[PDB]
Amino acid sequence: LSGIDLTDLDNFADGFPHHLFAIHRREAPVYWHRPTEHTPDGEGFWSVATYAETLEVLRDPVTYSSVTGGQRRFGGTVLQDLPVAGQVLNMMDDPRHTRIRRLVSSGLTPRMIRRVEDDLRRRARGLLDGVEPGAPFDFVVEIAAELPMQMICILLGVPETDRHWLFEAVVEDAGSRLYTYALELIAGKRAEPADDMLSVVANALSDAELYLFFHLLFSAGAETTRNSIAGGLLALAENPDQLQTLRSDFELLPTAIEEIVRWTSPSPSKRRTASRAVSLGGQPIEAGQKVVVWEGSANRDPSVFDRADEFDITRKPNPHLGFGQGVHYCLGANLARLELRVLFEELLSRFGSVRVVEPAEWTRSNRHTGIRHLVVELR
Amino acid sequence: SGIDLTDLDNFADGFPHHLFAIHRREAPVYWHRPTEHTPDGEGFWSVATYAETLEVLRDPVTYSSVTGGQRRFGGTVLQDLPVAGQVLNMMDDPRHTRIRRLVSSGLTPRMIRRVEDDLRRRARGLLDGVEPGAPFDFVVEIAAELPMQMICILLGVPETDRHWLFEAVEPGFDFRGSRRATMPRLNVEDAGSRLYTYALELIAGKRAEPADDMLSVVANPALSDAELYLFFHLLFSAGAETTRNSIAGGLLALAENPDQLQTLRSDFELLPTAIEEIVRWTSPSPSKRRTASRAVSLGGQPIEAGQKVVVWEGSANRDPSVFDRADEFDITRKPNPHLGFGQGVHYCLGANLARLELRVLFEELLSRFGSVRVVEPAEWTRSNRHTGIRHLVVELR
Ligand code: HEM
Ligand code: HEM
């Protein structure tokens, strides 16, 4: 570990670096990572790589805050302290967290879920019908990015005419245009309430807080869910025999989808801040210190998962942390599973041959594990 | 009752002086109800007269640049922004005094001359390249570069990084075909962005090897890294954008007042007074917001703690009860107690750099050119926080 820098993104440019985390779990499940030139804020942090300790942190939001602690003015849930800590749901603590979380969940109505599902079915079929068998194409740009972006446009109530602002955002100007458009959409919901999540929250927060919420959702669909779809396809391509088994029996799909989420772990790390002295993994943490947990590593901890380094679509049980755990548990878990189920039903219905014909290209990040391009041939 | 000061259509053609004449006459201090265009869906007190504007600016305890009442955060634009309290212009005492003094300590005589020497050579070179009589866009070709270079020099940005940085940090952007600007943001997607990474590496370098520039002084509560990034951005919006806009706006005013143009260029002793009239007339930063920290009466209106107050220096600067012939450009105007650079504890820290940029630019321009024709209608930045020209196509002879 002394020679390993978990903040050096050159180590994450080719996928989540599982080999480094095998060393981390073996050598020191919890340890103090000194800051390097690559470390946000030039400040060290406790790094947590094993499942039991990761789960312990996630399950104690009072000790391990998503806002701040000690003398630290602001924190949040990435390693860089952010002044928007305390102002968006995933960087909030009780009592305001419980209130806003319930308001957000009140927007995920059965009719909204049906609206998303109906659209998803129609679109997945259209896209898969358009595939030319045997002809290489970039599955990320043409399919994996498209479906969940449309899902979040429905949840947020973005009209077809205006969806390009969102696509274009996935340059500083692109970001400013997304921001400006989001503020216009939010004011529009205030003027004319609608039956969607943004309206629910806007009409219950400042516009700035509503933007943070908008972007949280936009990112969850446009990036995290896209990453699970692309990585699920890559995993199945790398395991053709399981692809065949799953194609032969879609009743296997729910268990397979949990294994895709464990395997891909698209959101592989989270930061918290200690609010008081506490011990974790037998080490003493002081109020104010940063704690980073690595669900991407926890999800391959062999203390918890048998043959943890193997993809197995029949895996049971499968208590993965890919959607988090505790009071901030992912509010979109069933929507993500829905996206994966519909896509793989439709894809595996038509194709039982998936070949990746160029090396996968990955996003360079230790906060997201994602594939930027994945050229495949489907037969 | 039919005017919406938050509808940017009213600002799309320049600052709407006619609307603010109405505002000063009918109600110097006015509760503006929220419309579809109003940030946060929340009303605010609107202040259009000079005296009442100063009552607000001169009382930073009652009219906070951070927040007030029960409001979680406020700041100095109409929209509530979470960077309130984290960037110098949106700080109150006691922190404001300490950071303003610190930033100010970076403005050494040495730095001023460094800026002046570079500005002189650049302005001379650009104006030397002008083909007399040939139309060109003054904003893009001359006015835009100079203050961006000034900021790079204050911040100690290496010359070799400036081409890249200019494209990245440019405060303006196009949206639906109009130019806009924003205040610096630091939301989740901005964390470890390319500009965040660049800025904090630049800061790391100056912590390892302190340099003779303002970013080194400030980087060596003190400003957290997040706050240093917001400060880096602040100088490009607060300093480079406004100064560019005063330059383009000053050229337009001179073009529209050919007799003033002749008087000025035939006696440069008048420059100092001319430059203050340019700032008054153009008022590049025409509005500010504050938040009331207690119940208070202003212009006979009962403001409550937590409520938003917007002052319009752009309107105050043409208040005919303080400026004679307020609606006329007069390069000899004296006295000229304009509010273009603010007033009180937040008075512009860069005012003398702005005056320097305007001085050098106009010495170089007017000594060469006595004829300035605007050959198309000016296009304006769509904003009520910045008054500025997007394009100004001119012929110089
Ligand atoms: C495979 C796709 C996804 C994965 C892997 C994922 C993962 C996660 C994780 C790990 C958290 C916990 C954050 C923490 O502990 O700090 C979370 C929270 C959250 N997720 Fe997701 N997510 C996914 C898709 C979605 C979607 C489609 C939505 C749309 C509703 C969504 C909405 C949210 C929200 C609103 C939170 C904040 C909950 C809270 O802080 O109370 N996610 N997600
Ligand atoms: C014509 C050009 C400029 C104009 C019209 C202008 C205008 C203003 C105004 C009206 C304020 C008051 C803010 C408030 O009351 O809330 C201000 C503050 C400030 N300005 Fe300028 N400015 C110009 C150029 C510059 C330059 C060139 C710099 C730096 C190089 C600069 C840096 C600042 C800073 C740091 C503050 C905040 C000071 C504080 O809060 O203590 N400005 N400016």
Swiss-Prot record, chain A:
According to its UniProt entry, the protein's GO biological process terms are:
cholesterol catabolic process
Disulfide bonding pattern of the chain: none
Classify the source by domain of life.
Answer: Bacteria
Give the matching Gene3D superfamilies. Cytochrome P450 (1.10.630.10)
Stored InterPro entries: Cyt_P450, Cyt_P450_B, Cyt_P450_CS, Cyt_P450_sf
Q: What is its EC number?
A: 1.14.-.-
Entry keywords, A to Z: Heme, Iron, Metal-binding, Monooxygenase, Oxidoreductase
Cofactor(s) the protein needs: heme
What is the top EC class of this enzyme, as a single word? oxidoreductase
- Name the PROSITE patterns for this protein: CYTOCHROME_P450 (PS00086)
Binding sites annotated in the UniProt record for heme: 330
Entry GO MF terms: cholest-4-en-3-one 26-monooxygenase activity; heme binding; iron ion binding; steroid hydroxylase activity
Family affiliation: Belongs to the cytochrome P450 family.
Q: Which PANTHER family match?
A: BIOTIN BIOSYNTHESIS CYTOCHROME P450, P450, PUTATIVE (EUROFUNG)-RELATED
Name the UniProt record assigns to this protein: Putative cytochrome P450 126
From Swiss-Prot, chain B:
Needed co-factor(s): heme
What does the entry list as the binding residues for heme?
A: 348
Name the Gene Ontology molecular function terms of this record. cholest-4-en-3-one 26-monooxygenase activity; heme binding; iron ion binding; steroid hydroxylase activity
Q: What is its EC number?
A: 1.14.-.-
PANTHER family assigned to the protein according to its UniProt record, in alphabetical order? BIOTIN BIOSYNTHESIS CYTOCHROME P450, P450, PUTATIVE (EUROFUNG)-RELATED
Give the record's family classification. Answer: Belongs to the cytochrome P450 family.
For this entry, the protein name equals Putative cytochrome P450 126
**What's its top-level EC category?**
oxidoreductase
